[PDB]
Design a protein around this nucleic acid. Structure first.
Ligand SMILES: O=c1ccn([C@H]2C[C@H](O)[C@@H](COP(=O)(O)NP(=O)(O)OP(=O)(O)O)O2)c(=O)[nH]1
Ligand SMILES: [Cl-]
Ligand SMILES: [Cl-]
Ligand SMILES: [Cl-]
Ligand SMILES: [Cl-]
Ligand SMILES: [Mg+2]
Ligand SMILES: [Mg+2]
Ligand code: NA
Ligand code: NA
Length: 326
DNA sequence: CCGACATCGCATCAGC
DNA sequence: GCTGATGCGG
DNA sequence: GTCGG
């Protein structure tokens, strides 16, 4: 919160580029700067001072000076005053509705929560559920609840097959006092980069979690990635808990470390690290880290037996999960 | 100046 | 049906 | 919007 004002401004700017301008790179550019500034250990006194940080160029430093003097940015003041942008921005908040869909709905007069509700027929499945739990999905999950959800998920998975290994990653694994959702990495000896000796591994788990009424809805479901909704059980007379988003990712057991690295994030930390890998001559994904050939083509998977092994290849000192929240 | 900017799963679509 | 491109999520 | 070469 040292430079909250500045990072909020950048984040707001980032969302506009993404949702309205549909300018993915400007969006990322703003996120990087917000990120680098968010960790900057000093209260920024000027754009020049900020422009010294990597990711902060001439344009952003100029905006920081405007914001510092006035306490606001005229460019954003206007954007907030543009109905179309206001609408597009709002619609993107529904899970399932992105920049394109948001703009399309707006072109059809559908531009408010009320418009959406009376037009469910014009929504795909995912968007439907996103609208259904709109409020709940805007709420944060106290870690305390994350702990309760962890017990349930791990114990239900164990019941299906003691050989499954479920790890809660994402912001939770990074130690956050609250998360936007629960992210679960799943593995089973039967599924390796070598073979799939047992199908429905993810399905089985999803089924058990539904049976106990933990998973309530589904956004999308494949053989390795499940995206849905879940809810903690409440007691008698107790008010119900909010519905929560849950992502489950089944990964080859022998590719655990690359998988846990990826799913632990943050997303920006991941972008920065994968970028660094490229510069060092490697390419990293949730499955492996591979060298980059002279032709550019990625080679064979390098041996990995710990997250640290990945950091070493790219010449980075290990960073605890708690220090990866960029 | 100018190209690169991380990576990929699932849903939906168009074209054949 | 298939593939490949796009959207949206990650 | 920013950066390296
Ligand atoms: O763009 C993305 C999004 C996510 N990820 C990875 C990192 C992130 O930590 C993880 C889980 O995705 P979430 O969207 O759940 N983010 P996270 O759990 O970090 O934060 P939050 O508390 O918002 O859920 O997936 C990427 O690599 N790229
Ligand atoms: Cl762009
Ligand atoms: Cl402002
Ligand atoms: Cl691995
Ligand atoms: Cl791979
Ligand atoms: Mg998460
Ligand atoms: Mg998630
Ligand atoms: Na800079
Ligand atoms: Na959305």
């Amino acid at each position: 919160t040292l430079n909250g004002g500045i990072t909020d401004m950048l984040t707001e700017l980032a969302n506009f580029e993404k949702n309205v301008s549909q300018a993915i790179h400007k969006y990322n550019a703003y996120r990087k700067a917000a990120s680098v500034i968010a960790k900057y250990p000093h209260k920024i006194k000027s754009g020049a001072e900020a422009k010294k940080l990597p990711g902060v160029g001439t344009k952003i430093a100029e905006k920081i000076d405007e914001f510092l003097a006035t306490g606001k940015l005229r460019k954003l003041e206007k954007i907030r005053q543009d109905d179309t942008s206001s609408s597009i921005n709002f619609l993107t908040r529904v899970s399932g509705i992105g920049p394109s869909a948001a703009r399309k709905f707006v072109d059809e007069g559908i531009k408010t929560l009320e418009d959406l509700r009376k037009n469910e027929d014009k929504l795909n499945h995912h968007q439907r559920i996103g609208l259904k739990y709109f409020g709940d999905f805007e709420k944060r999950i106290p870690r305390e609840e994350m702990l309760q959800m962890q017990d349930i998920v791990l114990n239900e998975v164990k019941k299906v097959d003691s050989e499954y290994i479920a790890t809660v990653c994402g912001s939770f694994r990074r130690g956050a006092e609250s998360s936007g959702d629960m992210d679960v990495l799943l593995t089973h000896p039967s599924f390796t980069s070598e073979s799939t000796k047992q199908p429905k591994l993810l399905h089985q788990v999803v089924e058990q979690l539904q049976k106990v009424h933990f998973i309530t809805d589904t956004l999308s479901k494949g053989e390795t990635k499940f995206m849905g909704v879940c809810q903690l059980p409440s007691k008698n007379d107790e008010k119900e808990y909010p519905h929560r988003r849950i992502d489950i990712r089944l990964i080859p057991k022998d590719q655990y470390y690359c998988g846990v690295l990826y799913f632990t994030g943050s997303d920006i930390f991941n972008k920065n690290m994968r970028a660094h890998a490229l510069e060092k001559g490697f390419t990293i994904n949730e499955y492996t880290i591979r060298p980059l050939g002279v032709t550019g083509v990625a080679g064979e998977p390098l041996p990995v037996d710990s997250e640290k092994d990945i950091f070493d290849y790219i010449q980075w000192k290990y960073r605890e999960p708690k220090d990866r929240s960029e």
